[PDB]
Amino acid sequence: MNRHYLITLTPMDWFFFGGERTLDDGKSADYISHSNKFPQQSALLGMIRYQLLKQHNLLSQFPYTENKPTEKEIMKTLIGEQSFRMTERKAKSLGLGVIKQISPLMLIECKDDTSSRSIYFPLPLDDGYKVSFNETSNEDKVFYNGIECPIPNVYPASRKFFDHKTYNNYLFWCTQGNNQIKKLLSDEIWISKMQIGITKHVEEGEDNDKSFYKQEFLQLKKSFIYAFYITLSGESELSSDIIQLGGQRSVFRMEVESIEENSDIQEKYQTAAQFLTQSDRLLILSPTYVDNLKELSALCNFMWSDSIVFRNIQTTNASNFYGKPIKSSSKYHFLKPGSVLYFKQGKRKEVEKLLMDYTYLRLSGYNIYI
Amino acid sequence: MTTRMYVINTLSNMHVGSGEVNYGVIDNLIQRDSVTNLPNINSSGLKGAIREYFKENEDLVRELFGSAPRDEKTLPGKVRFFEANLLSMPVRSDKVPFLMAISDEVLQELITKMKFFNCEEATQYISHLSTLLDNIKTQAQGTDFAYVFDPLLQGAIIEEVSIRATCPSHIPLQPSLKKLLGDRLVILSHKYFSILSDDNHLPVLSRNNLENGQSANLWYEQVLPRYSRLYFMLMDGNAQSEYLKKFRDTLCTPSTIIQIGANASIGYGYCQISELSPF
Amino acid sequence: MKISKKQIEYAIEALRANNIITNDNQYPKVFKGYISSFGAAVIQSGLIPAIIFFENEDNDANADRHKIIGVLKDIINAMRQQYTVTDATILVSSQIPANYSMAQYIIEHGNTDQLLKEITEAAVAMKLALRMYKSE
Amino acid sequence: MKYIAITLGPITRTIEMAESTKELWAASYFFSYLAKKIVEPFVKKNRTFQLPLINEEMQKPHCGAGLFPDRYIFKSEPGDLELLKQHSDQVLIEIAGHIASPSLPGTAKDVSQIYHYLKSYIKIYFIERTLESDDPHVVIPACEKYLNIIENQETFPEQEETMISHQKSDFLKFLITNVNGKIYRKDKNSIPRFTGSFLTRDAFGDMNGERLFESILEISASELNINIQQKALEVITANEKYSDQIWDAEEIILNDNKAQLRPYHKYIAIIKSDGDSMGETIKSMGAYNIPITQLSKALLSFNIESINEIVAYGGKPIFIGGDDLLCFAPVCCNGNNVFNLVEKLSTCFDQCINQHLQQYINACSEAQRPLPSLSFGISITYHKYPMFEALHTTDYLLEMVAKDNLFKYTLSNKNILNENMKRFILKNKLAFSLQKHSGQIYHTAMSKKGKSYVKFNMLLQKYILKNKDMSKTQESEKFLSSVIQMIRAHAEILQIILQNEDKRTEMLKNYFDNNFNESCHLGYTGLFEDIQTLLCLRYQENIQDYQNRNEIIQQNTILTSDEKEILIVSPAMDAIHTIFTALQFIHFINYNKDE
Ligand SMILES: [Mn+2]
Incomplete structure (x- = not known):
């Protein structure tokens, strides 16, 4: 039997999440740093692995190198042989320890009445707009890099055409109300702080006093938390604790709440997202990766989509955990949450199978749609 | 991991540079909280001050605070510092040289932070502070209030806001609450405290640079008043017990004075550090 | 002590109204010294003797010094039009009558503390306001 | 009949991949070059173009600026779509073949991978x-x-290897980083040269290429006539990729001759412009019958003459198409400041509109007569300041402040469009920002439709030193610092002076007279009179623009306190801030000591 847990994360201070232009990686762009609102699912996976190791006092790689003969296999059966790697994107299992499945990170509002938890999702890019095509072989055709598709007709659902100057759907996060969808501006959920720090001591006598850096620190609005669902193999309980989730020493409070045995966390996430389902499009709830975007384009009439960049930290059980981290040599482009895939008249199953072809990414919390 | 609350009790004027876009009368401003706009110290400043004090013991610094910048090998820190929030501030009176001013909102935020962080001595402190706040709210009944607890201090006039302090006999102040919040304490509405801690009522000092007997430059400096109290939270990532105990003992010994902020050579920001005493 | 914008505007209005600046935007150079002398007199002799000395005009007491006390009266009146009720604070607000000299008012019910504060703020406001005219 | 409308590429994404100035020029000219190549076959045929108005002068190589925009609308004849598809494929094939040429640095990359990357990255819709x-x-x-709505379809390269030096699956970054090619040498009896890529050959001409652009200091320090690039290049070649080494060498040789180095020679200016009320002008042309080809012709003439103006002044144009302008200039050259360049470009745009839009101007009554106008956003930053951040600063200036888009977005995102509030949108503005190498940021906004802009330009021209002062003391600069400090300290008393209506001018003069004693040592003479006049003009303009807007903003219950505070602009404080920013700019240009 497998334990099912709801993992709530409360920020105890201002938090940071790494991007590609981090504090010291590149060339003269390495003293201004910006933060991503959500951590990568690899951050959640590594958090779980770190907490599991610490619970069993198996934390290793202290500021010296040692060997672990008789605890290599305990480590392997507890956390897995290696970190989350996108090279194994097609495998049928996470290749990790007791961790079976992680739902995508969700934004949860906790009303100060312990009444219910409202889950906020990105606003679908088609919200409030009616997108229609002419499936006939008539005129008004579009060519997306040589592929011929029917022209989209976007009207507000309030015969005025789409206005690019009145478009703000990418700035909103939505939750279920009573009959309409409550829309929260993304600037209300997150607040931004630019911290300027220096190094007091001046070394080597060269030109100095310019050693000032800027970091963007994010904070969640009051009564807002992060959450995700995790399935743990056998009996490997997770203890509530104070944890780190990326960034410049960001501290979160882990609350582990148990849900019923006969439950599917994928089903629970889809049940939460059920209020956004329109049967003419595919809503991309979690970041989605496809090896060929051209084939996905051929299987749809219009993508109202965006991109995010993905890069991992690749560490093995024996890696030097204290030093320069080895990051994935390749960066991958994922479809942003809130993107809608307008499938052809009869090919929803085709695009669904294309997206579910990566079951490893599915178990990690990616390629989740509704 | 044992979260601990430390009080600061600055022994001199504190200037921690904000560095943000300044356009007003005062050229050098102090760091203020984004949300409450009360004076505060960034955890970067706290870590820097404590690491500078302990820099002569290299092993302790490497264990707790981490590796120095521009070092080939990078070691993570084991203590997490949280930002220091203003607890009480000296306000000027007429019966006594000064009074220690705390707002009811500062008290409530302290209660919430202790409940959230689970400080080691949080239980009794939270209970007694909650009782004090409830008694204060019952006495005020939604009106502006300025409550002193020593019967002698009755009738004290806070200078900048011409408020006369009253002494409700029903409200008991425990000795440990007095230790935490300070002596000669007045509990105000947050409007009064915000007025007293704003840019117009904080001490502004004039400075100039003399070249051959004539002033070359002139600027005005904002300083946190002497004897102010700030609290912060420290989290030990299960660091080595001996280094942790040495660090805590050195931090709590009376002979140890920490410099935080600018103007170190003219004695700005010199403070002690006090752990939360058991109630 | 910190002067608000409203007190400086009151000082401008009172300075123009009590006939100190001519229509040519010039004030006689003696009045800045008179304000400084009034402050020093308040410090050295006291509020009441300074007010009495500066309010008299029967002799050749420069024949213009009582205008300063007129301006102070106007400023204090204006400041006590507003900030009137403010029950949370300890101040008494009233309109000092035109026929009552300031010396008479402080003799009768001055209370010497609110009046000291108002007098010092009014004097500072007068100095700041005169900084925006030119000496004859 | 049949109409074909083309849009090209993600431009902002490519622009934000650029880290230096030559990289930004490469990013913009890549799309200009691609658009030119795509539309070449149909321009060669007699094809009526509605939107761009392709002309013979456009094809001729101007300076490295790109004149070809991203959107094209032309009347279609049968067989046009198939030819367009095949030519798009062939243009991408040619570009991919150019990228893999051995003249560029790095290992030999296969053409097929670059072609697939370009197909998955470049948008040709x-x-x-x-x-x-x-x-x-x-x-x-x-x-x-x-x-x-077509542009909302996203195409990206799915996988991007960026670490391995011989599996670099990032070819547009490679192209922009290595747009100048390599360096080739004789037996030491020769001069350094850059081989240059296809972009440099096409933009600057294959022959008679005097000198390619490598580092910011060449543009910024184009005053000392030191020939920075050749000296630095012979240093870096005598040493034993080249971008950072040549940048450092240029810095070293700039520091070597400090006898003429002013602090602003290490600062660069980013100029961005957008046409204001051009859509309303198009609607008024639709009502009062006059074809859009006249507006397109005026825009083209403005583009050409603006390229000439930017080149004549020390500077480099990047994109000059229609209303959009993007140029890098030094703060000063030959005694001309960048604000004189902004004035010259505003005058060129207005003069071209007057020249070619005479029919609409004289037909329409003076009551409505919207007319286009150029809104500018200027960012001055250290040459080592990251280009991404400086570009974002320039975009913020232009959009939010110069076009007053902050007001519009704040209202619209809360659904307070409210045509009453649409009546309050400000136009024809100049947005300025200066960031020193200390973290000090000075910014200002000014309306160009009044006398305040003219007074600002003449005030700058009067007190900007055309020749560096070789005095170790700089008494005038300490006087300027005292004036700056006393303006920022007495801001509230200045506000009180300004809020008075009838007698504010004499009160301002008297206040400055009383506060400053012997306020004339050397250089700045009559500065106070000009400052007071500019301040009064700014206050009157601010009262015209912002007062009713602020009153209506405060009365709106939907807006929160934070948004209302962000939107509210105090007239007197803004005027004082503008004076403060102008004085800080004068101090920055004049003072020899940096930081
Ligand atoms: Mn435009």
């Missing part, structure tokens, strides 16, 4: 629409509205 109307005024919006 075109649409065929049957419009039963010849008229351009209905044709252009009809195709543009569909293009707008």
Whole structure:
């Protein structure tokens, strides 16, 4: 039997999440740093692995190198042989320890009445707009890099055409109300702080006093938390604790709440997202990766989509955990949450199978749609 | 991991540079909280001050605070510092040289932070502070209030806001609450405290640079008043017990004075550090 | 002590109204010294003797010094039009009558503390306001 | 009949991949070059173009600026779509073959991978629409509205290897980083040269290329006539990729001769412009019958003459198409400041509109007569300041402050469009920002439709030193610092002086007289009179623009306190801040000591 847990994360201070232009990686762009609102699912996976190791006092790689003969296999059966790697994107299992499945990170509002938890999702890019095509072989055709598709007709659902100057759907996060969808501006959920720090001591006598850096620190609005669902193999309980989730020493409070045995966390996430389902499009709830975007384009009439960049930290059980981290040599482009895939008249199953072809990414919390 | 609350009790004027876009009368401003706009110290400043004090013991610094910048090998820190929030501030009176001013909102935020962080001595402190706040709210009944607890201090006039302090006999102040919040304490509405801690009522000092007997430059400096109290939270990532105990003992010994902020050579920001005493 | 914008505007209005600046935007150079002398007199002799000395005009007491006390009266009146009720604070607000000299008012019910504060703020406001005219 | 509308590429994404100035020029000229190559076959045929108005002078190589925009609408003949598809494929094939040429640095990359990367990255979207109307005024919006929703389809390269030095799956970054090619040498009896890529050959001409652009200091320090690039290049070649080494060498040789180095020679200016009320002008042209080809012709003439103006002044144009302008200039050259360049470009745009739009100007009454106007956003930053951040600063200036888009977005995102509030949108503005190498940021906003802009330009021209002062003391600069400090300290008393109506001018003069004693040592003479006049003009303009807007903003219950505070602009404080920013700019240009 497998334990099912709801993992709530409360920020105890201002938090940071790494991007590609981090504090010291590149060339003269390495003293201004910006933060991503959500951590990568690899951050959640590594958090779980770190907490599991610490619970069993198996934390290793202290500021010296040692060997672990008789605890290599305990480590392997507890956390897995290696970190989350996108090279194994097609495998049928996470290749990790007791961790079976992680739902995508969700934004949860906790009303100060312990009444219910409202889950906020990105606003679908088609919200409030009616997108229609002419499936006939008539005129008004579009060519997306040589592929011929029917022209989209976007009207507000309030015969005025789409206005690019009145478009703000990418700035909103939505939750279920009573009959309409409550829309929260993304600037209300997150607040931004630019911290300027220096190094007091001046070394080597060269030109100095310019050693000032800027970091963007994010904070969640009051009564807002992060959450995700995790399935743990056998009996490997997770203890509530104070944890780190990326960034410049960001501290979160882990609350582990148990849900019923006969439950599917994928089903629970889809049940939460059920209020956004329109049967003419595919809503991309979690970041989605496809090896060929051209084939996905051929299987749809219009993508109202965006991109995010993905890069991992690749560490093995024996890696030097204290030093320069080895990051994935390749960066991958994922479809942003809130993107809608307008499938052809009869090919929803085709695009669904294309997206579910990566079951490893599915178990990690990616390629989740509704 | 044992979260601990430390009080600061600055022994001199504190200037921690904000560095943000300044356009007003005062050229050098102090760091203020984004949300409450009360004076505060960034955890970067706290870590820097404590690491500078302990820099002569290299092993302790490497264990707790981490590796120095521009070092080939990078070691993570084991203590997490949280930002220091203003607890009480000296306000000027007429019966006594000064009074220690705390707002009811500062008290409530302290209660919430202790409940959230689970400080080691949080239980009794939270209970007694909650009782004090409830008694204060019952006495005020939604009106502006300025409550002193020593019967002698009755009738004290806070200078900048011409408020006369009253002494409700029903409200008991425990000795440990007095230790935490300070002596000669007045509990105000947050409007009064915000007025007293704003840019117009904080001490502004004039400075100039003399070249051959004539002033070359002139600027005005904002300083946190002497004897102010700030609290912060420290989290030990299960660091080595001996280094942790040495660090805590050195931090709590009376002979140890920490410099935080600018103007170190003219004695700005010199403070002690006090752990939360058991109630 | 910190002067608000409203007190400086009151000082401008009172300075123009009590006939100190001519229509040519010039004030006689003696009045800045008179304000400084009034402050020093308040410090050295006291509020009441300074007010009495500066309010008299029967002799050749420069024949213009009582205008300063007129301006102070106007400023204090204006400041006590507003900030009137403010029950949370300890101040008494009233309109000092035109026929009552300031010396008479402080003799009768001055209370010497609110009046000291108002007098010092009014004097500072007068100095700041005169900084925006030119000496004859 | 048949109309074909084409849109090209993600431009902002490529622009934000650039870290230096030559990289930014490469990023913009890549799309200009691609658009030119795509539309070449149909321009060679007699094809009527509605939107861009392709002309023979456009094809001729100007300076490295790109004049070809991203959107094209032309009347279609049968067989046009297949030819467009095949030519798009062939153009991408040629570009990929150019990237893999051994003249560029790095290992030999396979053409097929680069072609697939370009296909997955570059957006080439075109649409065929049957419009039963010849008229351009209905044709252009009809195709543009569909293009707008077309652009929302996202294409990206799925996998991007960026670490391995011989599996670099990042070819547009490679192209922009290595747009100048390599360096080739004789037996030491020769001069350094850059081989240059296809972009440099096409933009600057294959022959008679005097000198390519490598580092910011060449543009910024184009005053000392030291020939920075050749000295640095012979240093870096005698040493034993080249971008950072040549940058450092240029810095070292700039520091070596400090006898003429002013602090602003290490600061660069980013100029961005956008046409204001051009859509309303197009609507007024639709009502009062006059074809859009006249507006396109005025825009083209403005583009050419603006390129000439930017080149004559020390500077480099990047994109000059229609209303959009992007140029890098030093703060000063030959005693001319960048604000004189902004004035010259505003004058060029207004003069070209007057020249070619005489029919609409004289037909329309003076009551409405919207007319286009150029809004500018200027960012001055350290040459080592990251280019991404400086570009974002320039975009913020232009959009939010110069176009007053902060007001519009704040109202619209809360659904307070409220045509009453649409009546309050400000136009024809100048947005300025200066960031020193200390973290000090000074910014200002000014309306160019009044006398305040003219007074600002003359005040700058009066007190900007055309020749560096070789005095170790700089008494005048300490006087300027005292004036700056006393302006920022007495801001509230200045506000009180300004809020008075009838007698504020004499009160201002008297206050400055009383506060400053012997306020004339050397240089700055009559500065106070000019400052007071500019301050009064700014206050009057601010009262005209912001007062009713602030009153209506405070009365709106939907807006929160934070948004209301962000939107509210105090007239007197803004005027004082503008004076403060102008004085800080004068101090920055004049003072020899940096930081
Ligand atoms: Mn435009």
